[PDB]
Amino acid sequence: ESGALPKEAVVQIRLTKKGMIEEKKVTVQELRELYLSGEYTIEIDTPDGYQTIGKWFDKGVLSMVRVATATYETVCAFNHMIQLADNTWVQACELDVGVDIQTAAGIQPVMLVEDTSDAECYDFEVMHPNHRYYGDGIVSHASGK
């Protein structure tokens, strides 16, 4: 159980370097490149506001699933944890149509769940006790827990 995402997933980040600040959307592929440059402190947007990324994880190749609500769609690892309306966590592959989940637009029910092809994926630590972030607009758990 973690928060693993493929290269094409979109997140909202804030870069800081010696007084310079930049905020923008990036793909996880771009995020990895920015992280590995070592030039920035990187924060990610979360339901707890911007929170700092600590460790990074290259996760190898994992099974993937596509999950969509009316507003958002993510392709994520089968064991990528998504936050239900009641604050508890469920693996993406265990979601079923109708389940209410937390998104950047509030609670929305899942409309689509579809297994897809194995892909390279990535995870990271968020330095907040809720350990969560927005991944493709859906509230996701960062790392294990």
In three-state secondary structure terms, 108 is: strand
> Which tokens belong to 64?
């993937």
Q: CA dist 123 to 10, 56, 93, Å?
A: 13, 6, 17
Helical spans, DSSP H, in the chain: 28-37
**CA–CA separation, 43 and 40 (whole Å):** 9
Residue in the block written with tokens 């190898």: 60
Contact criterion met (CB below 8 Å) for 77 and 2 = yes
**CA–CA separation, 34 and 12 (whole Å):** 13
Report the 10 Å Cβ neighbour count for 73. 14
Question: By C-alpha distance, which of 90, 81, 73, 91 is closest to 142?
Answer: 81
The phi, psi pair for 33, rounded to 5°, reads -60, -45
Domains in the chain, please, with CATH? Answer: 5-145 (2.170.16.10)
Return the amino acid letter for 128.
H
Return the amino acid letter for 32.
R
Question: By C-alpha distance, which of 123, 19, 41, 39 is closest to 76?
Answer: 123
Beta pairing class for 20-27 and 10-17: antiparallel
**Technique behind the model:** X-ray
What's the reported resolution, in angstroms, to a tenth? Answer: 1.5
**CA–CA separation, 52 and 127 (whole Å):** 5
Cβ-in-10-Å burial (0-12, 13-18, 19+) of 141 comes to buried
Beta pairing class for 5-6 and 89-91: unpaired
